[PDB]
Amino acid sequence: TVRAAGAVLWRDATVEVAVIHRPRYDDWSLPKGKLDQGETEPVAAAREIHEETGHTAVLGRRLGRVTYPIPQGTKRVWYWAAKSTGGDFSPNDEVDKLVWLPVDAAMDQLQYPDDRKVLRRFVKRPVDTKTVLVVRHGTAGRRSRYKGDDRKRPLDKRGRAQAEALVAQLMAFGATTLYAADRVRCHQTIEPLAQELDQLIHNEPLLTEEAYAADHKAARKRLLEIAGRPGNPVICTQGKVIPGLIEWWCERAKVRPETTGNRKGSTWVLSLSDGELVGADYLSPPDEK
Amino acid sequence: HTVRAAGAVLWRDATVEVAVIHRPRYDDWSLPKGKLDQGETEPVAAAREIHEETGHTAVLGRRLGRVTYPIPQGTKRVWYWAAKSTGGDFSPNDEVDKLVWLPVDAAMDQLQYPDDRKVLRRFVKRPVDTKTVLVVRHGTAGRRSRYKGDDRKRPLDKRGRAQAEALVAQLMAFGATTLYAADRVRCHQTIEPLAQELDQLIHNEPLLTEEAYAADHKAARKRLLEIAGRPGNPVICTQGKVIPGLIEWWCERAKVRPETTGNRKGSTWVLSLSDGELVGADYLSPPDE
Ligand SMILES: Nc1ncnc2c1ncn2[C@@H]1O[C@H](COP(=O)(O)OP(=O)(O)OP(=O)(O)O)[C@@H](O)[C@H]1O
Ligand SMILES: Nc1ncnc2c1ncn2[C@@H]1O[C@H](COP(=O)(O)OP(=O)(O)OP(=O)(O)O)[C@@H](O)[C@H]1O
Ligand SMILES: [Cl-]
Ligand SMILES: [Cl-]
Ligand SMILES: [Cl-]
Ligand SMILES: [Cl-]
Ligand SMILES: [Cl-]
Ligand SMILES: [Cl-]
Ligand SMILES: [Cl-]
Ligand SMILES: [F-]
Ligand SMILES: [F-]
Ligand SMILES: [F-]
Ligand SMILES: [F-]
Ligand SMILES: [F-]
Ligand SMILES: [F-]
Ligand SMILES: [Mg+2]
Ligand SMILES: [Mg+2]
Ligand SMILES: [Mg+2]
Ligand SMILES: [Mg+2]
Ligand SMILES: [Mg+2]
Ligand SMILES: [Mg+2]
Ligand SMILES: [Mg+2]
Ligand SMILES: [Mg+2]
C-alpha cells in the first residue's frame, strides 16, 4: 500500500556510497521516501535523494524492490543506482548525519538486511552506465474513430498529460537527446521534454511499425547507431516495434527484465556499460502503478 | 535396459544455421545430445550437453519429440529440443573435435543418422524463433483439511520444497525471465528458489487462483494472454484446477497437439509462441518423477 523509492547514491572515491542517519529510529540506511501525488518512482527517488542528502543525482540501473510491513499497511521501495552530480549535506528535517563509505564499510554500516541486499545488487554490475530510454507514445484515442490519416492521429487529453508527466521521469535519468518515429503521436509524447531541454526531436522513419515490419534489421541497426552516440537518448516509438527491439537486445546480452510491459506511455530504461547492455528496466506509464 | 538421453537442434540466425558435431569415438556427424545424469530432467540434460559439446550457451524452445535406437546395451531413448544459441564459441573437447554450422538443407546431408534427420524434419515444421511461457503447477503442500490457518497461507512440504529447488535448473534451461504466481503462498514458494537465483520479485496474480478461475475463467484467459504478450519469457505458477482448462483452451484455439500430458504438482507446460500464436505445448513431468 505505501509506495516509496530510493537509491544507492554513489560518487567516485573506487566508489563511495552515501549512508544516512535518521534520529527518529536512530538508524543507518539508504536515502528513500514516499511518492507524492502524481510522481512516479524515479521522480520520487531523485527528489528524496536531494531532500535527504543535498545531492543532485542522475539515476541509472534499477536495483529491485523491497517490501516490508508498516503501521499504514505495506511499504514498497524501488531502488536505483544514482550517481551524485554534486551538492552538500546539512542536517535537515529527516536526516542528521551522512557518511560516504566504500562498499565494504557501507555494508557494515547499513543495519537493515534489505538495504544490504540492494547494495549487493549495486556492486554486481557496472554503475557508471549510459542510458537509452525507449518510450511508447502516450494515449491517442482510437484508430476506428479518427477521421484522417492514422499516421497523424494525435495524443488525446490523457496522453498529453502523460507527455507532461514524462519530463520529470526522463530527466531523472539525465536524458540529453531526443528521437521519435515518424508519427505525430510519438513526437507529441516527447515535445514537452524537448521544450524542457530546448532540443530538437530527430525524426526516425526506420522505427515506425511499418518500416520495422518490412526491415526489422535496419531498425535494430539504427537503434545501435543511436545508442552509440554520446549522451542518453530518448527514443519514442509505437507498440509493435518495442517488444521486438527489447527482446532482441536482452537475449543478446542475457539481461532479464524484472518487470515487463508495453503500455502507452511506458518506458524501458536500458543501461549500457562500454556499449554492452547491463539492465533493462520497465517503467509503467506515469499515470498507472 | 533403456538409456535415457536428451539433446537439441542448436541453431542461430544466418535464414537459420544449425550445429552439426563430429565425434572421434565413432567418426560420426550428429546432433548434440547426451545421457541424463542422476536425478536430472531431460531439459536440464539437453542444456548441459549442448554447452559441454558445442561450447555454446543456449535457450531451449519447442520440444521435437523422441527417438529410440538400439545400442550394445539395449535401447537409447533421446528427447530433443530446438535450442537457440545465446553465445559462446566451440573448442575441441573430450567428446567433440569439430563443429560446423550449416543451413538446414546442408545439415540434412551432413547428418548421417536417420533419427537425427527425423528430428531436423520436426524442427523445420514450425517456427523456432519462439517466445516461451512456462506454466507451472505448485509443488506438494500437504492438504487443506490438516492445515489450521487460512488455506491461502498453506506452505510447501519438504518434498514440495525439493521440487521448487529442482525447478530452478528446469526453468532456466528455457530462458525464464519474468516471474508470476497466483495469490497463494504455495505458488509463490514454488518459484521462490528461482526468484533467489534470478534475484527478482514474483508478480502476484489474483485472477489466476482456482477460485478466481471458477468465477471468471475469461478473465484468467485474458490475463494469461496479457502476460504472454509482454517482452520476456514468463513463468506462471498456478493451481491444478486452472491449468488443464487454460492449456486445453489454448491448444484447441491454435490446433496444437501436445505429445505428452499430465497435471502433476511440480509439473511444467512449456508453451511456445510465434508472433503471439501457440506452436507447441510440451508437458514436463515434475522434476522428481
Ligand atoms: N529497509 C528496511 N527494512 C526493514 N525495516 C525498515 C527499513 N527501513 C525502515 N524500516 C523500519 O520500518 C519502520 C518505518 O520506517 P520507514 O523509513 O519505512 O518510514 P518513514 O519514516 O515514513 O520514512 P520514509 O519517508 O523515508 O519512507 C521503522 O520501524 C523502521 O525501522
Ligand atoms: N542418432 C543415432 N541413430 C542411430 N545410431 C546412433 C545414433 N547416435 C549414435 N548412434 C550409434 O549408437 C551407438 C551409441 O552411440 P551414442 O552416441 O548413442 O552413445 P554415447 O557414445 O554414449 O554418446 P552420448 O553420451 O552422446 O549419448 C554407437 O554405435 C553410435 O554410432
Ligand atoms: Cl495507438
Ligand atoms: Cl509513412
Ligand atoms: Cl506505422
Ligand atoms: Cl496501453
Ligand atoms: Cl494443494
Ligand atoms: Cl500431483
Ligand atoms: Cl493461438
Ligand atoms: F523520506
Ligand atoms: F517520504
Ligand atoms: F520524505
Ligand atoms: F554426450
Ligand atoms: F552423456
Ligand atoms: F556426455
Ligand atoms: Mg524523505
Ligand atoms: Mg519520507
Ligand atoms: Mg526517507
Ligand atoms: Mg518524503
Ligand atoms: Mg555423453
Ligand atoms: Mg556429451
Ligand atoms: Mg553426446
Ligand atoms: Mg554426458
Curated annotation (Swiss-Prot), chain B:
Keywords: DNA damage, DNA repair, DNA replication, Hydrolase, Magnesium, Metal-binding. The keyword Amino-acid biosynthesis does not apply. It comes from Mycolicibacterium smegmatis (strain ATCC 700084 / mc(2)155) (Mycobacterium smegmatis). A motif (Nudix box) lies at residues 34-55. Mg(2+) 1 binds at residues 33, 53, 95. PANTHER family: 8-OXO-(D)GTP PHOSPHATASE, NUDIX HYDROLASE 23. Its cofactor is Mg(2+). Forms head-to-tail homodimers. Belongs to the Nudix hydrolase family. This is 8-oxo-(d)GTP phosphatase. Ap4A hydrolysis is inhibited by fluoride ions. Can also use Mn(2+), with lower efficiency. Catalyzes the conversion of 8-oxo-dGTP to 8-oxo-dGDP, and 8-oxo-GTP to 8-oxo-GDP. At high enzyme concentrations, can also catalyze the conversion of 8-oxo-dGDP to 8-oxo-dGMP, and 8-oxo-GDP to 8-oxo-GMP. In addition, catalyzes the hydrolysis of the diadenosine polyphosphates diadenosine hexaphosphate (Ap6A), diadenosine pentaphosphate (Ap5A) and diadenosine tetraphosphate (Ap4A).
